[PDB]
Structure 1
Amino acid sequence: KLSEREAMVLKMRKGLIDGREHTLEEVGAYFGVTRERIRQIENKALRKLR
């Protein structure tokens, strides 16, 4: 039940993309957003699953 963007980010952060876990910094650069936003999204997606 996660949006395209939400899922992406966790695969990013968790390395589920290229085996490498990515700092907020890098993922932010990818979607063109601030590290803050990423985290906020990550966490939101995490809450969505529990």
Structure 2
Amino acid sequence: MKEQLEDVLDTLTDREENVLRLRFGLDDGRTRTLEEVGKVFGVTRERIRQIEAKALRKLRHP
């Protein structure tokens, strides 16, 4: 789901999209823990998880 994930990212803000790029290793190839990602954003593991959930839900519909 490289194209579909991309269409989803287009609907998120810069910040949310980059959370997901980091998470899924879309740029450097390496997936990252919710904790690495949370540290990069200065937010909790849970907030990163909610962003990921929002994206998966968007990924399912269209």
TM-score, normalised to structure 2, is 0.70
Give the 4+ runs in structure 1 shifted more than 4 A.
Answer: none
Residue segments in structure 1 that go unaligned for 5+ positions in a row: none
Paired position in structure 2 for 1:14: 24
Overall identity of the aligned pairs, in %: 72
Residue segments in structure 2 that go unaligned for 5+ positions in a row: 1-10
Q: Greater relative contact order (Cα 8 A, min sep 6): structure 1 or 2?
A: 1
TM-score, normalised to structure 1, is 0.84
For the pair shown, the structure with the greater C-alpha radius of gyration is: 2
